[PDB]
Design an enzyme around this catalytic site. Structure first.
Site, short mmCIF file in Angstrom:
data_model
loop_
_atom_site.label_atom_id
_atom_site.label_comp_id
_atom_site.label_asym_id
_atom_site.label_seq_id
_atom_site.Cartn_x
_atom_site.Cartn_y
_atom_site.Cartn_z
N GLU A 1 12.17 12.67 1.63
CA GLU A 1 11.10 12.07 0.80
C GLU A 1 9.72 12.68 1.14
N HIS B 1 0.85 -1.21 0.00
CA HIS B 1 0.00 0.00 0.00
C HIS B 1 0.87 1.25 0.00
N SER C 1 15.13 6.09 -11.78
CA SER C 1 14.14 6.86 -12.56
C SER C 1 14.12 8.29 -12.01
N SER C 2 13.97 8.45 -10.69
CA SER C 2 13.81 9.78 -10.05
C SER C 2 15.13 10.55 -10.05
N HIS D 1 12.95 11.43 5.46
CA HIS D 1 12.41 12.77 5.80
C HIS D 1 12.40 13.66 4.52
N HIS E 1 13.90 12.22 14.20
CA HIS E 1 12.56 12.24 14.85
C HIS E 1 11.76 10.98 14.48
N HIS E 2 12.25 10.16 13.54
CA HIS E 2 11.65 8.83 13.25
C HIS E 2 12.28 7.76 14.16
N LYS F 1 3.88 30.03 4.08
CA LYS F 1 3.16 29.61 2.86
C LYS F 1 1.66 29.59 3.15
N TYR G 1 8.96 15.61 2.18
CA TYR G 1 8.91 16.99 1.62
C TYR G 1 8.87 16.91 0.07
N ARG H 1 0.20 0.89 15.50
CA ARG H 1 0.09 0.73 14.03
C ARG H 1 0.63 -0.66 13.64
N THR I 1 6.77 27.04 6.80
CA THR I 1 5.49 26.43 6.39
C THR I 1 4.33 27.42 6.65
N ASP J 1 11.30 21.78 -24.96
CA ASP J 1 11.17 20.45 -24.34
C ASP J 1 12.00 20.46 -23.05
N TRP K 1 7.03 -0.36 4.97
CA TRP K 1 7.72 0.30 3.83
C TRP K 1 9.13 0.78 4.23
N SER L 1 -0.30 26.98 -5.02
CA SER L 1 -0.02 28.42 -5.22
C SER L 1 -0.66 28.84 -6.55
C1 HEA Z 1 3.46 15.19 2.92
C2 HEA Z 1 4.24 14.48 3.72
C3 HEA Z 1 4.64 14.93 5.07
C4 HEA Z 1 4.86 16.22 5.51
C5 HEA Z 1 4.84 17.47 4.70
C6 HEA Z 1 5.16 16.05 6.95
C7 HEA Z 1 5.39 17.18 7.79
C8 HEA Z 1 5.81 17.16 9.16
N1 HEA Z 1 5.93 16.02 9.87
FE1 HEA Z 1 5.42 14.12 9.30
N2 HEA Z 1 5.43 12.22 8.50
C9 HEA Z 1 5.04 11.77 7.28
C10 HEA Z 1 4.72 12.64 6.19
C11 HEA Z 1 4.83 14.07 6.28
N3 HEA Z 1 5.14 14.78 7.39
C12 HEA Z 1 5.04 10.34 7.11
C13 HEA Z 1 4.76 9.54 5.89
C14 HEA Z 1 5.45 9.87 8.39
C15 HEA Z 1 5.59 8.42 8.83
C16 HEA Z 1 6.64 7.59 8.26
C17 HEA Z 1 6.41 6.19 8.75
O1 HEA Z 1 6.73 5.92 9.93
O2 HEA Z 1 5.86 5.39 7.96
C18 HEA Z 1 5.63 11.09 9.16
C19 HEA Z 1 6.10 11.01 10.50
C20 HEA Z 1 6.55 12.10 11.28
C21 HEA Z 1 7.24 11.94 12.57
C22 HEA Z 1 7.66 10.67 13.26
C23 HEA Z 1 6.60 10.28 14.28
C24 HEA Z 1 6.81 8.86 14.83
O3 HEA Z 1 6.97 7.94 13.98
O4 HEA Z 1 6.77 8.66 16.10
C25 HEA Z 1 7.43 13.30 13.04
C26 HEA Z 1 8.18 13.68 14.24
O5 HEA Z 1 8.50 14.82 14.52
C27 HEA Z 1 6.91 14.16 11.98
C28 HEA Z 1 6.75 15.60 12.12
C29 HEA Z 1 6.39 16.47 11.04
C30 HEA Z 1 6.53 17.91 11.18
C31 HEA Z 1 6.91 18.77 12.36
C32 HEA Z 1 6.12 18.36 9.87
C33 HEA Z 1 6.13 19.80 9.41
O6 HEA Z 1 6.83 19.91 8.17
C34 HEA Z 1 4.69 20.35 9.41
C35 HEA Z 1 4.68 21.89 9.42
C36 HEA Z 1 3.31 22.43 9.20
C37 HEA Z 1 2.58 23.12 10.07
C38 HEA Z 1 2.98 23.31 11.51
C39 HEA Z 1 1.20 23.59 9.66
C40 HEA Z 1 1.16 24.97 9.00
C41 HEA Z 1 1.78 26.04 9.87
C42 HEA Z 1 1.12 27.10 10.40
C43 HEA Z 1 -0.36 27.39 10.16
C44 HEA Z 1 1.97 28.08 11.20
C45 HEA Z 1 1.73 28.11 12.64
C46 HEA Z 1 2.11 26.83 13.35
C47 HEA Z 1 2.70 26.78 14.54
C48 HEA Z 1 3.16 27.92 15.37
C49 HEA Z 1 2.90 25.40 15.10
N4 HEA Z 1 6.17 13.47 11.02
C1 HEA Z 2 0.59 9.09 -0.55
C2 HEA Z 2 0.58 8.20 0.41
C3 HEA Z 2 -0.65 7.55 0.89
C4 HEA Z 2 -2.00 7.59 0.42
C5 HEA Z 2 -2.60 8.39 -0.69
C6 HEA Z 2 -2.68 6.66 1.33
C7 HEA Z 2 -4.05 6.39 1.23
C8 HEA Z 2 -4.80 5.56 2.13
N1 HEA Z 2 -4.28 4.95 3.21
FE1 HEA Z 2 -2.37 4.74 3.73
N2 HEA Z 2 -0.41 4.57 4.21
C9 HEA Z 2 0.63 5.18 3.69
C10 HEA Z 2 0.51 6.18 2.63
C11 HEA Z 2 -0.68 6.53 1.96
N3 HEA Z 2 -1.90 6.05 2.25
C12 HEA Z 2 1.94 4.79 4.22
C13 HEA Z 2 3.26 5.38 3.93
C14 HEA Z 2 1.62 3.84 5.26
C15 HEA Z 2 2.52 3.17 6.24
C16 HEA Z 2 2.85 1.73 5.84
C17 HEA Z 2 3.73 1.08 6.90
O1 HEA Z 2 3.32 1.09 8.06
O2 HEA Z 2 4.81 0.53 6.56
C18 HEA Z 2 0.15 3.81 5.13
C19 HEA Z 2 -0.61 3.03 6.01
C20 HEA Z 2 -2.03 3.01 6.17
C21 HEA Z 2 -2.71 2.41 7.31
C22 HEA Z 2 -2.10 1.84 8.55
C23 HEA Z 2 -2.01 0.30 8.37
C24 HEA Z 2 -1.39 -0.34 9.64
O3 HEA Z 2 -0.65 0.40 10.38
O4 HEA Z 2 -1.63 -1.58 9.90
C25 HEA Z 2 -4.10 2.61 7.00
C26 HEA Z 2 -5.20 2.26 7.89
O5 HEA Z 2 -6.37 2.59 7.69
C27 HEA Z 2 -4.14 3.28 5.67
C28 HEA Z 2 -5.32 3.62 4.95
C29 HEA Z 2 -5.36 4.40 3.77
C30 HEA Z 2 -6.64 4.63 3.12
C31 HEA Z 2 -7.96 4.11 3.57
C32 HEA Z 2 -6.24 5.44 1.97
C33 HEA Z 2 -7.07 6.02 0.88
O6 HEA Z 2 -8.08 5.03 0.65
C34 HEA Z 2 -7.60 7.38 1.32
C35 HEA Z 2 -8.26 8.00 0.03
C36 HEA Z 2 -7.28 8.27 -1.11
C37 HEA Z 2 -7.44 7.76 -2.36
C38 HEA Z 2 -8.57 6.90 -2.65
C39 HEA Z 2 -6.42 8.05 -3.45
C40 HEA Z 2 -7.02 8.69 -4.65
C41 HEA Z 2 -6.03 9.00 -5.77
C42 HEA Z 2 -6.00 8.40 -6.94
C43 HEA Z 2 -6.89 7.24 -7.32
C44 HEA Z 2 -5.08 8.89 -8.01
C45 HEA Z 2 -5.84 9.56 -9.14
C46 HEA Z 2 -4.94 10.06 -10.23
C47 HEA Z 2 -5.17 11.07 -11.07
C48 HEA Z 2 -6.30 11.97 -10.91
C49 HEA Z 2 -4.17 11.43 -12.15
N4 HEA Z 2 -2.88 3.43 5.15
CU LIG Z 3 10.49 13.02 9.15
#
Ligand code: HEA
Ligand code: HEA
Ligand SMILES: [Cu+2]
Ligand SMILES: CCCCCCCCCCCCCCCCCC(=O)OC[C@H](COP(=O)([O-])OCC(O)COP(=O)([O-])OC[C@@H](COC(=O)CCCCCCCCCCCCCCCCC)OC(=O)CCCCCCCCCCCCCCCCC)OC(=O)CCCCCCCCCCCCCCCCC
Ligand SMILES: CCCCCCCCCCCCCCCCCC(=O)OC[C@H](COP(=O)([O-])OCC(O)COP(=O)([O-])OC[C@@H](COC(=O)CCCCCCCCCCCCCCCCC)OC(=O)CCCCCCCCCCCCCCCCC)OC(=O)CCCCCCCCCCCCCCCCC
Ligand SMILES: CCCCC/C=C/C/C=C/C/C=C/C/C=C\CCCC(=O)O[C@H](COC(=O)CCCCCCCCCCCCCCCCC)COP(=O)(O)OCCN
Ligand SMILES: CCCCC/C=C\C/C=C/C/C=C\C/C=C\CCCC(=O)O[C@H](COC(=O)CCCCCCCCCCCCCCCCC)COP(=O)(O)OCCN
Ligand SMILES: CCCCCC/C=C/CCCCCCCCCC(=O)O[C@H](COC(=O)CCCCCCCCCCCCCCC)COP(=O)(O)OC[C@@H](O)CO
Ligand SMILES: CCCCCC/C=C\CCCCCCCCCC(=O)O[C@H](COC(=O)CCCCCCCCCCCCCCC)COP(=O)(O)OC[C@@H](O)CO
Ligand SMILES: CCCCCCCCCCO[C@@H]1O[C@H](CO)[C@@H](O[C@H]2O[C@H](CO)[C@@H](O)[C@H](O)[C@H]2O)[C@H](O)[C@H]1O
Ligand SMILES: CCCCCCCCCCO[C@@H]1O[C@H](CO)[C@@H](O[C@H]2O[C@H](CO)[C@@H](O)[C@H](O)[C@H]2O)[C@H](O)[C@H]1O
Ligand SMILES: C[C@H](CCC(=O)O)[C@H]1CC[C@H]2[C@@H]3[C@H](O)C[C@@H]4C[C@H](O)CC[C@]4(C)[C@H]3C[C@H](O)[C@]12C
Ligand code: CUA
Ligand SMILES: [Ca+2]
Ligand SMILES: [Mg+2]
Lengths: 56, 227, 72, 75, 513, 44, 258, 75, 72
Positions: free
Chosen positions: E242, E61, E156-157, E240, E290-291, E319, E244, E438, E316, E91, E126, E255
């Site tokens: 990734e 998934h 690829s990337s 991390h 932080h992970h 923006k 962003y 989880r 952030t 291009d 993953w 934007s």
């Molecule tokens: C789009 C992808 C994306 C983005 C952008 C972020 C953004 C951030 N993430 Fe998240 N993160 C994930 C995807 C993402 N994360 C995924 C996939 C995992 C799990 C990986 C895994 O274990 O599978 C994860 C896990 C993860 C962890 C690990 C938790 C754990 O496993 O125990 C932490 C820890 O600090 C973290 C923190 C943050 C923080 C601080 C931001 C910041 O960048 C967010 C900043 C944004 C704001 C704060 C909101 C807007 C701000 C304002 C309106 C201003 C005012 C706000 C304040 C004064 C607070 N995230």
């Molecule tokens: C981009 C990343 C992404 C997206 C989109 C999603 C989408 C969804 N994810 Fe998840 N998810 C992860 C990234 C994502 N997830 C990751 C990183 C984990 C952690 C795995 C791990 O633990 O190792 C995870 C794990 C995770 C769990 C935890 C499982 C566990 O811990 O045992 C669950 C539980 O409900 C969940 C549910 C869902 C559901 C219900 C949706 C969706 O059904 C929500 C609705 C969204 C859609 C339906 C997508 C629609 C988009 C398209 C179809 C594309 C269309 C294209 C064009 C228009 C060009 N996902």
């Molecule tokens: Cu991180």
């Protein structure tokens, strides 16, 4: 050796509509057919291997 | 343990879990306010026929947008780091207990005085005694003295696991070849439950932790009976 | 210029290689292999190698590379 | 003696080296006290501390390796 | 002619189209996997009867949604279509290498679906942490096929990053500085720099895992003096950056969409938006541990990672407030694309704020490896990325196709998807705070009500996906050809018509100094 | 190469019903695949 | 067109390259698990055929067809620098693994580096010779570059031949070292870090040498002008990268790590 | 015992660390033995070696500093 | 360009100084001085200093710099 770049410029600029990968002549066709046959055949073989490996 | 329809943390059983509750309440108020302000401002930007489409000067407002969030982050980080350094401060434990993760059960070693050790396996659903909890009970609980500072050492004999007890604020990964330390202190007697918290294969969902917290005199009688 | 880099090539770089070649070729004799001890952090075998009998490393040297059970 | 006290040499979450150092210290001391037919009671502090901290399987593996001639630490 | 055009392409638009088709298909795979997860968690007890299979489904998934849906759509699809158009370039820099970035993805995907079909699959998460991912606990080819899938996706990337950076630096009009390029183009450049630097470290790490599994190396094996925690550092040093990478092109598209439907010629505070993305990119490299707050690192290390992580909120917030200030004073068009973008700003903000909660290592002890983390990233990543993709798709569909969508259907689609994702993920906060781990196939009985509600929400989102396919069919079925589009003076990608000719900017734009 | 709406895609939109068949096979194959992989694993 | 950029003819090599990657990876899988080298040898063959024909076509497009305007050449310069940066970060991961293991040696090693039972190579013998060889090759390739810029065919060919000869010498010395080494890849994390880091470096030396040999034959065929020779510049940059990675390996693994 | 044997830890011309190590080792052992009320005779090898190698003025200065509480090595 | 180097000055360099200034700010405030021990390798006096009473270092701080005979 002698500088024959002018003769290669003339060959590769000939107005014959060929894409650059085939423009050297018959040898380019042969090398392309070998490469594509190995890639496509290899890919078919990799799918058979997947089929085999998917079961005990 | 958690209860049905629970919204927040399990009730605190240790002073550090208490601290985390107060800290979460503080941080959640901020999260709520900022979430709400952004939703409100979206609604304010969208609800007027008045227009201003010419170039706007950004310099003055960007000071507010950086300074106010900076202050808010400092107001989160100060108490955050106070708690972090409290859960590091030197304590005199009176007991050391080891736990070793396995696929899929925990073992415990109490080797301060005698070589006491045992395995702790999940009670299968088919074997639960009436009123016992699905996926949470074990055959051998971790008997510990209440109101005393305990050193837990955590490792694994195979893959990664993680030893967790939410109501005590505890989660320490179990890594083979590494001995991780955490401190445990229960304010109360009773049974305190947790679950393996690093994916360890097919039975990750099925190797829980049960602490049994009793007065020191009862802990000593239990230790003595083990001989 | 080209003249300067040729001067460095022949006057510094290749003389250095000649001197390091002389140094190496003076210390090229075989060292006496150390007693075999079946240390558990060495001669690792978690999966057979995908060649030979599965128990020999890719550039196995019988004189200096013992197997898990010792020198051949 | 209740349990191993805080040791400023090993103040962090990773206690691997605390276990290892006290096992080495006990075995170095034991060998010194036997090598004049001395007395192994002198080594007691290290024994209590490694017994308290070290996983049984680590102690058991290290013991087996000392007996085999494959223990990689200096005793 | 068909093979020459679609297998042998050197055209940025056709390659963008291939990426969009690939990503849409992948999204169906990723969605099916998500519904299997939620079918298992929808009732206590076992459904699949095979928790290794559950773990394989969760692992697949994540890989599918990240590597085969989000990145191909945002960078390969929108990036290839829009970047050259927005800078008047004929291009990409390397139009043939571009085609190889595309064609590596189907083989990458085939390797992932081979991993799941051989032995008992890769039930690793993953993250693919050893020793669970090693040759004892995951004997057989599944993890090796997963590693190879990631190597092909990585190449690829990396090549795509080299192409985008070179294109964006070298192929603007000679008068156009970097400070006259649209924010979407900035967002792709910065994403490409993150890819270029992060993916090689992942490649080093998974190569070590491959050698530990097959060549008797012990990088991650304590028996040889290795360390499982080294793998985690290398993985998250990539991971991390990734997350962003997954959001930055989304920020760029938001934007453009907010600016367009506010009736503005320009986003509020352009140079602050550039500053914010560059700041996020840079800070994104110094926060990875932080992970790892529960692995046993030193208190001062935890203090540093908490503090550095929280700093990302400042750029952030600039923006978020800049998007709001672009709305301010607008003649707002309530288009479906605008709805997606407004949904993005709110849902992204909620998930970013739960990120700031998790940044606090002390609290992270209790929240790590719980549904609180799953809730966090499905708001910021799953909804953020998906809502930005859907906004971009409905905004630029008429450019790419030449045809209009039914705006009422598109609004219905938005409404269903907004209800579904919130019903799915909001309750997972409660599950996390109350201590549900989880990566669990089953849960203590207390957690039943919120898991039941979450699974019901997942079906609502399914209904939205099925409706989206119908809406795309209806646009191609009806053939409403675009006549006019507003604001072309500040949206150059539209100025060659819908769709633009195969070759655009054969005669480059004229821009004087 | 052919230019313009319906001509810059690797599938035909000449007939909306043939298109519906192709889109059904395309998206339906993707959606079905995981269900069949789970079945394949359960049947071992 | 009235821009200076290159619209490339539709090409099969991206697809043959992508399929070569599928065959090499599925091939490695079939070698590691299913005791068979067939897919892997097809993949290596198709990869070599793909690289040959792709880079042949780039020579056709530039030397023979004139498509490399200054703007195109500037693009390729950025492309090669960015590629080298990606390769530096790949090596960084192996150096990180090395320093992680060596700075905190675990009890299994004896709590020391090198580990108990590891007898490192004397860094003052062949490894020092290897260092002198690659540093010397950096001097000779700079002589080649200046000879080309100055229009001197004979001295460019002599300098480039000397550079290639030193690359080959390094490769034969390293092959000999590998065979003579009393430790192996299976000798715990010492062997793991040593052979994987130096092995990827040796691969890059073979790649770099092959690139210089391509430049040698292009120079023999008068492809390069005194002003236009980006393939030569790219091969030189790559070669300097290979030298610098060696210097870091030498200081880190051979010297500090002994 | 005739004199201090060759020690592979200290194979070069500068023998300062050899003197120092054996002085430390003697005094660490003497402390560990007096503290349990065990036998300082087990420390004798270190004593003979440091007395053979160490200049009289070094030993005298180090003894004075241990008595003053200014000895900078760990005993 | 000047524009880019100004952007780096105000967008990266000065924000860095501001963050490190905060960090320093927060960790300031005097730490307790250690027990005086008259170590012979410290408080070296082979010749009187050419200022004051000959026994005070140039930036002598009475709170943390003991004399050879201990804290003032
Ligand atoms: C789009 C992808 C994306 C983005 C952008 C972020 C953004 C951030 N993430 Fe998240 N993160 C994930 C995807 C993402 N994360 C995924 C996939 C995992 C799990 C990986 C895994 O274990 O599978 C994860 C896990 C993860 C962890 C690990 C938790 C754990 O496993 O125990 C932490 C820890 O600090 C973290 C923190 C943050 C923080 C601080 C931001 C910041 O960048 C967010 C900043 C944004 C704001 C704060 C909101 C807007 C701000 C304002 C309106 C201003 C005012 C706000 C304040 C004064 C607070 N995230
Ligand atoms: C981009 C990343 C992404 C997206 C989109 C999603 C989408 C969804 N994810 Fe998840 N998810 C992860 C990234 C994502 N997830 C990751 C990183 C984990 C952690 C795995 C791990 O633990 O190792 C995870 C794990 C995770 C769990 C935890 C499982 C566990 O811990 O045992 C669950 C539980 O409900 C969940 C549910 C869902 C559901 C219900 C949706 C969706 O059904 C929500 C609705 C969204 C859609 C339906 C997508 C629609 C988009 C398209 C179809 C594309 C269309 C294209 C064009 C228009 C060009 N996902
Ligand atoms: Cu991180
Ligand atoms: C795990 C593996 C990973 C797989 C991932 C797959 C998903 C990614 C797909 C990427 C896209 C592939 C496109 C490559 C070229 C197409 C080749 C092909 O097969 O052609 C048949 C087919 C076109 O059919 P058509 O209408 O008859 O076209 C006739 C031509 O116009 C007239 O030309 P012609 O007459 O010369 O040629 C037509 C003829 C013959 O043409 C040829 O001569 C070409 C032959 C070689 C082509 C081989 C292609 C290989 C692709 C592999 C995967 C990538 O083709 C056929 O009719 C039969 C071919 C059928 C082959 C099946 C391929 C379908 C795609 C894969 C589906 C997934 C299956 C996996 C199963 C999973 C099981 C576990 O092309 C497609 O594959 C198109 C996709 C299907 C339609 C989907 C429409 C959805 C719309 C949604 C819009 C969202 C995006 C918005 C876009 C923006 C607007 C601009
Ligand atoms: C459309 C899609 C539909 C959505 C899906 C369905 C959602 C399910 C609804 C939940 C209703 C639960 C319920 O029965 O509430 C009764 C509940 C009865 O109160 P209670 O049992 O005395 O709880 C007091 C606790 O001690 C209070 O302390 P605690 O520690 O027990 O509670 C802490 C916990 C529980 O917090 C709550 O009390 C509820 C959360 C408020 C939701 C907004 O809050 C969390 O930490 C949740 C994490 C959320 C992360 C940030 C979310 C940003 C929100 C966006 C704001 C937008 C403005 C509008 O009433 C509430 O407070 C509402 C919940
Ligand atoms: C002489 C200087 C340079 C020589 C180059 C090497 C020659 C043979 C193989 C070439 C490929 C090498 C690259 C690095 C990979 C791993 C090991 C290579 C290092 C090497 O050659 O190490 C040898 C072992 O090789 C082994 O196991 C087996 C080696 C063969 C199998 C390797 C298969 C693994 C492939 C990994 C693919 C990953 C690709 C990365 C892509 C990333 C893209 C993002 C050492 O011999 P030994 O007997 O243990 O000790 C010597 C004792 N006297
Ligand atoms: C804030 C940084 C700037 C430093 C300016 C301040 C002080 C004087 C100038 C310094 C010039 C640089 C180096 C000279 C050597 C010593 C000074 C080192 C820096 C310093 O200022 O050291 C101080 C001692 O100064 C002392 O002895 C002071 C002694 C003053 C006399 C100096 C003697 C000059 C030496 C001759 C220079 C020869 C140069 C030759 C050039 C080459 C020609 C071929 C430290 O104070 P303290 O109380 O011991 O400890 C702090 C306790 N709280
Ligand atoms: C037995 C052998 C085993 C090893 C096999 C593995 C691979 C070996 C491959 C070695 C690389 C050969 C590259 C040859 C490139 C030839 C084409 C070339 O050099 O093309 C030049 C352009 O450069 C360009 O594209 C620049 C092209 C840059 C290519 C960079 C290649 C580095 C490749 C690395 C491969 C990945 C390694 C990763 C391993 C983990 C053409 O422009 P000019 O030179 O200006 O000429 C024009 C003038 O004549 C006009 O007057
Ligand atoms: C375990 C095994 C798994 C490994 C799988 C291997 C993956 C794929 C198979 C590789 C097949 C490669 C075939 C040759 C590719 C040559 C690309 C090239 O040389 O691309 C050049 C651009 O990149 C440039 O310069 C600079 C960039 C040159 C890059 C050369 C290819 C490198 C491939 C691997 C490297 C990954 C990086 C290692 C660090 C992680 C040319 O661009 P084009 O658009 O063609 O032309 C433009 C025209 O104007 C030229 O006249
Ligand atoms: C032009 C396109 C290219 C098309 C590809 C052609 C495919 C060739 C089919 C040959 O298949 C082979 O059969 C061998 C013998 O049946 C196998 O040997 C291996 O498997 C044997 C099983 O008995 C073992 O003895 C050994 O491991 C080993 O010899 C080997 O795996 C397999 O590849
Ligand atoms: C957070 C959401 C909303 C934030 C809005 C911030 C917008 C700031 C507007 C600044 O634009 C100015 O407005 C003035 C007229 O009013 C003009 O006189 C001035 O020239 C102009 O530059
Ligand atoms: C005679 C011939 C002329 C080349 C020409 O101008 O066409 C010369 C010029 C430079 C020569 C090369 C350079 O002197 C470097 C090499 C010298 C070796 O002794 C033989 C091979 C070697 C690689 C030479 C082969 C051949 O003799 C070359 C190629
Ligand atoms: Cu043990 Cu999860
Ligand atoms: Ca279930
Ligand atoms: Mg974890």
């Amino acid at each position: 050796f002698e500088n024959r770049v002018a003769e290669k410029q003339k060959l590769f600029q000939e107005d014959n509509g060929l894409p650059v990968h085939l423009k050297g002549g018959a040898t380019d066709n042969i090398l392309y057919r070998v490469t594509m046959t190995l890639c496509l055949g290899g890919t078919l073989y990799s799918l058979y291997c997947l089929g085999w490996a998917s079961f005990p | 343990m958690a209860y049905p329809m629970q919204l927040g943390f399990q009730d605190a059983t240790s002073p550090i879990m208490e601290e985390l509750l107060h800290f979460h309440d503080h941080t959640l108020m901020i999260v709520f306010l900022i979430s709400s302000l952004v939703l409100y401002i979206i609604s304010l930007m969208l609800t007027t026929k008045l227009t201003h489409t010419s170039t706007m000067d950004a310099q003055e407002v960007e000071t507010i947008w950086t300074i106010l969030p900076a202050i808010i982050l400092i107001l989160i980080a100060l108490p955050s780091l106070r708690i972090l350094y409290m859960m590091d401060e030197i304590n005199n434990p009176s007991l050391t207990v080891k736990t070793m993760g396995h696929q899929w059960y925990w073992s415990y070693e109490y080797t301060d005085y005698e070589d006491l050790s045992f395995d702790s396996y999940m009670i299968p659903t088919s074997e639960l005694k009436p009123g016992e909890l699905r996926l949470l009970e074990v055959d051998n609980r971790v008997v510990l003295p209440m109101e005393m500072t305990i050193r837990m050492l955590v490792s694994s004999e195979d893959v990664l696991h993680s030893w967790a007890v939410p109501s005590l604020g505890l989660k320490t990964d179990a890594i083979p070849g590494r001995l991780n330390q955490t401190t445990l202190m229960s304010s109360r007697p009773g049974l305190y439950y947790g679950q393996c918290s690093e994916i360890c294969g097919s039975n990750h969902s099925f190797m829980p932790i049960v602490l049994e917290l009793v007065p020191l005199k009862y802990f000593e009688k239990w230790s003595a009976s083990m001989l | 210029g080209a003249r300067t880099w040729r001067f460095l090539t022949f006057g510094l770089a290749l003389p250095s290689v000649a001197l390091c070649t002389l140094n190496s070729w003076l210390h090229s004799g075989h060292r006496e292999r150390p007693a075999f001890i079946p240390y558990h952090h060495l001669r690792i075998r978690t999966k057979p190698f995908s060649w030979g009998d599965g128990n020999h490393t890719f550039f196995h040297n019988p004189r200096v590379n013992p197997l898990p059970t010792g020198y051949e | 003696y209740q349990t191993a006290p805080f040791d400023s040499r090993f103040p962090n979450q990773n206690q691997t080296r605390n276990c290892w150092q006290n096992y080495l210290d006990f075995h170095r001391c034991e060998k010194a006290m036997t090598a004049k037919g001395g007395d192994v009671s002198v080594c007691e502090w290290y024994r209590r501390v490694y017994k308290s901290l070290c996983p049984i399987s680590w102690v058991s593996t290290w013991d087996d390796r000392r007996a085999e001639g494959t223990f990689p630490g200096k005793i | 002619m068909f093979i020459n055009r679609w297998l042998f392409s050197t055209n940025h638009k056709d390659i963008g189209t291939l990426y969009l088709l690939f990503g849409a298909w992948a999204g169906m795979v990723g969605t099916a996997l998500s519904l299997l997860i939620r079918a298992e968690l929808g009732q206590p007890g076992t459904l699949l009867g095979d928790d290794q299979i559950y773990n394989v489904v969760v692992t697949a998934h994540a890989f599918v949604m990240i590597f085969f849906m989000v990145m191909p759509i945002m960078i390969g699809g929108f990036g290839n279509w829009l970047v050259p158009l927005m800078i008047g370039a004929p291009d990409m820099a390397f139009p043939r290498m571009n085609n190889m970035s595309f064609w590596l993805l189907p083989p990458s995907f085939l390797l992932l679906l081979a991993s799941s079909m051989v032995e008992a699959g890769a039930g690793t998460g993953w993250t693919v942490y050893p020793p669970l991912a090693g040759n004892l606990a995951h004997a057989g080819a599944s993890v090796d096929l997963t590693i190879f899938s990631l190597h092909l996706a990585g190449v690829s990337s990396i090549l795509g990053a080299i192409n985008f950076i070179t294109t964006i630096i070298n192929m603007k009009p000679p008068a156009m500085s970097q400070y006259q390029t649209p924010l979407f183009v900035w967002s792709v450049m910065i994403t490409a720099v993150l890819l270029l630097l992060s993916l090689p470290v992942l490649a080093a790490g998974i190569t070590m895992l491959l050698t530990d599994r097959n060549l008797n190396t012990t990088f991650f094996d304590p028996a040889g003096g290795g360390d499982p925690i080294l793998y985690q550092h290398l993985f998250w040093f990539f991971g991390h950056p990734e997350v962003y990478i997954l959001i930055l092109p989304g920020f760029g598209m938001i934007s453009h969409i907010v600016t367009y439907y506010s009736g503005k010629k320009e986003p509020f505070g352009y140079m602050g938006m550039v500053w914010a993305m560059m700041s996020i990119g840079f800070l994104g490299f110094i926060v990875w541990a932080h992970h790892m707050f529960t692995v046993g690192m030193d208190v001062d290390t935890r203090a540093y990672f908490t503090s550095a992580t929280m700093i990302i909120a400042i750029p952030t917030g600039v923006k978020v407030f800049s998007w709001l200030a672009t709305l301010h004073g607008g003649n707002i068009k309530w288009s479906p694309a605008m709805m997606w973008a407004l949904g993005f700003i709110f849902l992204f903000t909620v998930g970013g704020l739960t990120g700031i909660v998790l940044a606090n290592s002390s609290l992270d002890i209790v929240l790590h490896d719980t549904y609180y983390v799953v809730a966090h990233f499905h708001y910021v990543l799953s909804m953020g990325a998906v809502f930005a993709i859907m906004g971009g798709f409905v905004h630029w569909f008429p450019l790419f196709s030449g045809y209009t969508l039914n705006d009422t259907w598109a609004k219905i689609h938005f409404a269903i998807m907004f209800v579904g994702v919130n019903m799915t993920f909001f309750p997972q906060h409660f599950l996390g705070l109350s201590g549900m781990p989880r990566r669990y196939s089953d849960y203590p009985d207390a957690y039943t009500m919120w898991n039941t509600i979450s699974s019901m929400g997942s079906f609502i989102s399914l209904t939205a996906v099925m409706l989206m396919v119908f809406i795309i069919w209806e646009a191609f079925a009806s053939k409403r050809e675009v006549l006019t589009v507003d604001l072309t003076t500040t949206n150059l990608e539209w100025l060659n018509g819908c769709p633009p000719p195969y070759h655009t900017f054969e005669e480059p734009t004229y821009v004087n100094l | 190469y052919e230019e313009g709406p319906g001509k810059n895609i690797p599938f035909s939109v000449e007939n909306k019903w043939r298109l519906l068949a192709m889109m059904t096979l395309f998206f339906g194959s993707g959606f079905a695949a995981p269900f069949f992989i789970v079945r394949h694993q359960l049947l071992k | 067109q009235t821009h200076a950029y290159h619209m490339v003819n539709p090409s099969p090599w991206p697809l043959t390259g992508a399929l070569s990657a599928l065959l090499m990876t599925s091939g490695l899988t079939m070698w590691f698990h299913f005791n068979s080298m067939t897919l892997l040898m097809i993949g290596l063959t198709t990869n070599m055929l793909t690289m040959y024909q792709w880079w042949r076509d780039v020579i056709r497009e530039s030397t023979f067809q004139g498509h490399h305007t200054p703007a195109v050449q500037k693009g390729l310069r950025y492309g090669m620098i960015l590629f080298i940066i990606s390769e530096v970060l790949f090596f960084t991961g192996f150096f990180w693994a090395f320093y992680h293991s060596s700075l905190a040696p675990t009890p299994e090693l004896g709590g020391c580096w090198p580990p108990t039972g590891i007898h490192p190579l004397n860094p003052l013998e062949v490894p020092l010779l290897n260092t002198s060889v690659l540093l010397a090759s950096g001097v000779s390739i700079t002589w080649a570059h200046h000879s080309l810029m100055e229009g001197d065919r004979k001295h460019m060919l002599q300098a480039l031949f000397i550079t290639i000869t030193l690359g080959v010498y390094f490769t034969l010395l390293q092959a000999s070292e590998y065979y003579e080494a009393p430790f192996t890849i299976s000798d715990g994390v010492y062997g793991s870090t040593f052979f994987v880091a130096t092995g990827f470096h040796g691969l890059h030396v073979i790649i770099g040498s092959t690139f210089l040999i391509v430049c040698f034959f292009r120079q023999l065929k008068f492809h390069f002008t005194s002003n236009h020779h980006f393939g030569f510049e790219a091969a030189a940059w790559y070669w300097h990268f290979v030298d610098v990675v060696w210097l870091f390996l030498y200081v880190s693994i051979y010297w500090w790590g002994s």
